[PDB]
Paper text:
B Residues targeted for mutagenesis were chosen by their proximity to the binding interface between with [name] and i53 and are shown in red (T12, T14, L67, H68). To understand the molecular basis of the improved activity and binding of the de novo i53 variants identified in our screens, we solved crystal structures of each variant bound to [name] (S2.2, S2.3, S2.4, S2.5 and S2.6). B Zoomed in view of the complex at the solvent-exposed loop preceding β5 for i53, L67H, and L67R. C Zoomed in view of the complex near i53 residues 12 and 14 for wild-type i53, T12V.T14H.L67H, and T12Y.T14E.L67R. All recombinant variants complexed with the [name] Tudor domain and exhibited increased binding affinity relative to parental i53, suggesting a correlation between the improved affinity of the selected variants and their enrichment in the GFP+ population in our screening platform. The selected i53 variants outperformed WT i53 at all loci, leading to 1.5–2.5 x  increase in the HDR fraction over the no protein control.
An alternative way to improve HDR editing rates is through downregulation or inhibition of key factors involved in competing NHEJ and MMEJ pathways, such as [name] and DNAPKcs (NHEJ) or DNA polymerase theta (MMEJ). Using targeted saturation mutagenesis at the i53:[name] binding interface and a screening process in primary human [name] (a cell type with intact DNA repair, DNA damage sensing responses and other cell stress sensing signaling pathways), we identified i53 variants that introduce stabilizing interactions with [name] and are more potent than i53 at increasing HDR editing outcomes in [name]. Using these classifications, we determined that the addition of i53 variants results in an increase of HDR by specifically reducing NHEJ events but not MMEJ nor other types of outcomes, consistent to their role as [name] antagonists.
Author numbering:
A (entry chain A): 1485 to 1603
B (entry chain B): 1 to 74
Write the structure that this text describes.
């Protein structure tokens, strides 16, 4: 049911949500997640957003070219060769970011939980 | 100040630091959180190594609070 779905999920109380996919429901409200960067761990369902792609006008945190993460707003997405890219605006300028370069702060992800949270 | 550190496993962790933190202190913070001994840690920011003997301020990385640098272990 949720297995194989793309999600954004955090693994600590006050942590950031990172993109990945669910690989298993392990019960006790936990799910095994494979994050896109290769990290695998069990995460609480309350900490999973079943949101893919992240919707337009969501405030996110994105890794720019210069290797700083900072806040921006999603303005579009595109799928190419099976990879997803987001068009994100920062300080008035849009650039294209790989999916795995886009994360959510606690506050940013909490804004999505009512609509998209698991459970 | 919030920073991110990408480990060799693919996992990214956060830390709080100030410009006055020494690189050795950053490595000790990474050990404390993630268990990686400092002797295994080689840090970089945007392709430039952050070396023992220095502080974060020496690299002019930390600006205002909204910019969160990603350091990488190599």
């Amino acid at each position: 049911s949720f297995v194989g779905l793309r999600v954004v999920a955090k693994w600590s109380s006050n942590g950031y949500f990172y993109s990945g996919k669910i690989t298993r429901d392990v019960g006790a409200g936990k799910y095994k997640l494979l994050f896109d960067d290769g990290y695998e761990c069990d995460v609480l369902g309350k900490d999973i957003l079943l949101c893919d792609p992240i919707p337009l006008d969501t405030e996110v945190t994105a890794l720019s070219e210069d290797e700083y993460f900072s806040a921006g707003v999603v303005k579009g997405h595109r799928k190419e060769s099976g990879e997803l890219y987001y068009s994100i605006e920062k300080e008035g300028q849009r650039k294209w970011y790989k999916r795995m370069a886009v994360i959510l702060s606690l506050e940013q992800g909490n804004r999505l939980r009512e609509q998209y949270g698991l459970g | 100040m919030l920073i991110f550190v990408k480990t060799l496993t693919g996992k990214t962790i956060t830390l709080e630091v100030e410009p006055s933190d020494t690189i050795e202190n950053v490595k000790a913070k990474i050990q404390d959180k993630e268990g990686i001994p400092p002797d295994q840690q080689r840090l970089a920011f945007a392709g430039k190594s952050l070396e023992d003997g220095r502080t974060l301020s020496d690299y002019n990385i930390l600006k205002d609070s909204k910019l969160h640098p990603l350091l990488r272990l190599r």
